[PDB]
Write a protein that binds this ligand. Structure first.
Ligand SMILES: Nc1ncnc2c1ncn2[C@@H]1O[C@H](COP(=O)(O)OP(=O)(O)O)[C@@H](O)[C@H]1O
Ligand SMILES: Nc1ncnc2c1ncn2[C@@H]1O[C@H](COP(=O)(O)OP(=O)(O)O)[C@@H](O)[C@H]1O
Ligand SMILES: Nc1ncnc2c1ncn2[C@@H]1O[C@H](COP(=O)(O)OP(=O)(O)O)[C@@H](O)[C@H]1O
Ligand SMILES: Nc1ncnc2c1ncn2[C@@H]1O[C@H](COP(=O)(O)OP(=O)(O)O)[C@@H](O)[C@H]1O
Lengths: 305, 306, 306, 305
């Protein structure tokens, strides 16, 4: 899809809630289209509407950006900002981000072409369509454990990428002027105004994300297209086992994850994956011994499990 | 074998006990087969059932994973997590794990084809769909922070791209880690599993404990498994025309020596057995060619003098 | 007051909301009274119901504890835990907390007696049975390890003797900390409560959360409580013969300014209110003596220009 | 009591299980009596049978030693060994242990005398009867976060105390030749043979302690004389509330603590204190409003709580 409301709808198929974050990337992606519709010098003066996402861990910041890029057939790279503060001879320079992105556009163009010029198209796509997700940008803006580049230095090193620079790769120079950047952080260890002024100026769009509620966990489990329940159901189908979850079993699974997030650590929706798996441990092991049968998991089964 | 109960049975041929750990890797391996039966988009949405093994040292964490990979003809790489906290210019980046794995899948595909650009293409296919990566002492890179290189949390952060899904460059071409299985292990005395990065927890769906080995476990480790130390020394002395025999009380005596050393010096698990049988066999290992055709019996008394 | 519901009601006079936190300190204080009703050995086996408060900054953690201590005529000491991680030769040891507490109990007993070796003896008695110690940012000394003094875990380890029970030397004599109540607080974004030393967890029986303050909370904080900022500025301007008046829309406007600043710069909780009323009162605070006998009304429009 | 079997019995009133650890301190305390029964120079050649306790956290190492000393009317000091590895101008020298011990013997002699000579008796008791508990002695024997004395240096600093030295205090010199030392550690970060040889030689008795079982938690809750249940029952009696626990409620409370120790962290019996308190939160708050009544807590009440 190509329209912002259409983009929001496509993202609804995989991400529950977070409407503001969904609309922010839609605007950013739609503006890339508006730029290419422009003609003349104005085509070279408009820059990507880069985004700063603020929100707790495991509530959809990566997922929204990752699905967005797949929607737009754009090459995507996720990186943890603090990795550039560590010593190391391999992969400690931020231009590795751009080199990896071309490496992802090559393997992306090969898939579409099948269905020298290919390498050129990977270099064309990377410049005009690349999407870069920089996680925990809040951690490189704090009051200063890494013995490498300082935190402000990682910010200073990010400036050439998001302002516009040329980067050398094993396939040739890559310009970053019109690559879209999505940055994210919780901003408990720092605040958004602790970013370098030059970085603030290259983050036009600011959007918050909210904690997931108990109802959010229920819908995340069942409603989205690649949901965990649909995965476990699909995996047991290959063993000739029709797996069924009652509605109270789904409520019970969501409650286990909410409670653990409330007593151990709130890791957001990442808790769901580990909770369903232990409840399905007995049936995942014995599934070939149960072929042809229909297995219904109720609230009581989740309780004993 | 391809079935979880069948996998557990194959592992019983080499590992004593640790039934929960055996069933955990079976589930993880069986899900790889369940995934490839899927067709469509769901084939690209299911991720490996990575495992966190919790247990003391030398009770079968590496051995289970290593036998599992050989059972599945899958390329296998074991790595010590804390090695990435040290300074150095060779092999200090976690992508070295993935490069080594292709290096092991290439040499694996050549063996089966014989019994080539196309071989390298499948070695890149095998590595992506069948690779198994064992990360030891993942508990030590989650502690309260001697390595002067990457910090402990930084080694975790560097592991995130591998287990979440990334493309890695090699001397043979780009490799995706999306469908590689990861088995991680630690004792978790210096830290706890919730000290791992949240992003890491979410990519470790299966959690399994392992237990200390008991005195009876040592006796069965010595004799019952297919590649047991006793069966090795017997086979080694057969090449010298010497029938090496252990009485049943001798095996008990050897197990008791190892338990006591693990109880008074340090508990290193079943690794103590190797050094204990070897010192008792010192006299015969030296003189065996001078003793050809003869039968050498090690009893409880011989273990005592040894 | 002496009853938990009565304690909650007394705290309602100064703190808006945070009902769970109010009831938590009530239980802890009521158990002190329950203990002294006991006679015999059980009188020496019951230990204070120490509290861990979890909540964002500036929502009432210090204020609740501080009002509680004044309600109970108990000596009170607030300390920043991370101060003990810094180098220095004055006041860098945790026993300084206890020495300061006696210093506050002495000056407390003198006030009540007037309205002396015997005073110091009871100040040493009061400190032991009635002292209240508030330790802020106990979450920061439980993180992954800028202070060049004691390490973070070391500050925890140094706190163990205080909350488990120890004798501390002072310029007035030995003081036991066995029956001192401890209230600890943190946001727990940089760490989690299970990152505390096991020995510390066991001496924190009561766990209570506090919530963010809402826009309506700011309005009630401004006006409803007994020592509210509005009642302070009104009283301060009364000494100049100026009737200071706030309309209800003006109070909403002031609360909105603070919410927006907490939403765009940094969320510092109710601390934002103090700086916001002060800038709106800048014009009148200066000219009030030149305006004696007059009435000054601050409306929504006046807050807008200000 | 004065006999080792009698000592073991007195400790049974407060500590569940750990029979080996109980007998080890009994031997050590009984030998102090055997020494004072000796006459002549042999009286000056026998040294305390110091103990190294090995065991997990929160299973009774401190409690056994603390109760033992109270049984013997002996002044007692507990210290965390790693505290001497930290920088600091106050209380970072191991002789503070001995100075604190005299400070505890003074306040101990005043209690018994009531029921210059007193200070002399505090100096007499400290030398002949002091008991020093050094916790986590395993942590100062590891492979080397404190920026002060090194770990081996803390061991080296402990040598004068346990071999025999004179220590100056605000009341006068204190000899440590016949002070009993109980040291403890889990020995996962190191092993007992990592201690300095001179320290090994001054730790004659070696005793292990075991993890607490589910049944241990049940007996710890109810059976011992100062148990948590008897405290909460006694505290509610001062409010005219007869609090009663069913047997299944006690089982339920023990199960909550075992599960948390199995999923968060095994902190031993320290988990019990925090678990009963949250279950009693509603009644502890409302107890004055319920005076004259009898309140029975069953398994179902522990479940909702
Ligand atoms: N709102 C949500 N809707 C659907 N899935 C979600 C949501 N929030 C988190 N998830 C899932 O939880 C996991 C972690 O989420 P992710 O977006 O990567 O985290 P973060 O916000 O920390 O980047 C992924 O499997 C993701 O699909
Ligand atoms: N349960 C067991 N059954 C059989 N052999 C075992 C067992 N535990 C340990 N061993 C043997 O002891 C040695 C060390 O075991 P290993 O699994 O590699 O240790 P770790 O669990 O620390 O990874 C190997 O020779 C292994 O075969
Ligand atoms: N809920 C509240 N009710 C009343 N005053 C409050 C509330 N929260 C904060 N305040 C006021 O805001 C300031 C800071 O609050 P305080 O409790 O000291 O912060 P913290 O919770 O960080 O300890 C004080 O002036 C306090 O009176
Ligand atoms: N076996 C036990 N019997 C009775 N109480 C115990 C036992 N183990 C631990 N406790 C209690 O748990 C808490 C911590 O125990 P403690 O002996 O101080 O720990 P450690 O072994 O770490 O020194 C104390 O309240 C203690 O009374």
């Amino acid at each position: 899809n190509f329209s912002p409301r259409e983009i929001v709808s496509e993202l609804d198929r995989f991400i529950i809630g977070q409407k503001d974050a969904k609309r922010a990337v839609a605007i950013a992606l739609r503006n890339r289209w508006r730029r290419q519709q422009l003609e003349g010098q104005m085509r070279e003066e408009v820059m990507p509407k880069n985004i700063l996402m603020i929100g707790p861990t495991g509530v959809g910041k990566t997922e929204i950006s990752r699905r967005l890029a797949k929607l737009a057939g754009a090459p995507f790279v996720k990186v943890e900002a603090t990795k550039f503060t560590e010593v190391g001879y391999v992969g400690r320079d931020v231009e590795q981000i751009i080199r990896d992105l071309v490496e992802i556009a090559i393997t992306l163009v090969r898939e579409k072409r099948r269905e020298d010029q290919i390498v050129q198209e990977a270099l064309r796509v990377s410049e005009d369509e690349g999407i870069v997700f920089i996680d925990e940008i809040d951690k490189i803006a704090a009051r200063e454990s890494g013995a490498g580049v300082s935190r402000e230095g990682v910010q200073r090193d990010l400036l050439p990428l998001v302002e516009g620079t040329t980067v050398a790769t094993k396939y040739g120079p890559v310009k970053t002027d019109h690559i879209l950047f999505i940055t994210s952080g919780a901003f408990h260890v720092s605040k958004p105004s602790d970013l370098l002024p030059e970085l603030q100026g290259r983050l036009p769009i600011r959007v918050e994300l909210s904690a997931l509620t108990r109802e959010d966990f229920r819908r995340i489990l069942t409603e989205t297209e690649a949901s965990l329940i649909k995965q476990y159901i699909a995996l047991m189908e290959t063993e000739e086992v029709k797996l069924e979850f009652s509605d109270d079993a789904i409520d019970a699974l969501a409650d286990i994850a909410v409670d653990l997030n409330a007593t151990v650590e709130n890791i957001g929706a990442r808790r769901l994956q580990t909770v369903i798996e232990k409840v399905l441990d007995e049936i995942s092991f014995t599934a070939p011994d149960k072929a042809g049968a229909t297995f219904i998991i109720d609230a009581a089964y989740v309780k004993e499990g």
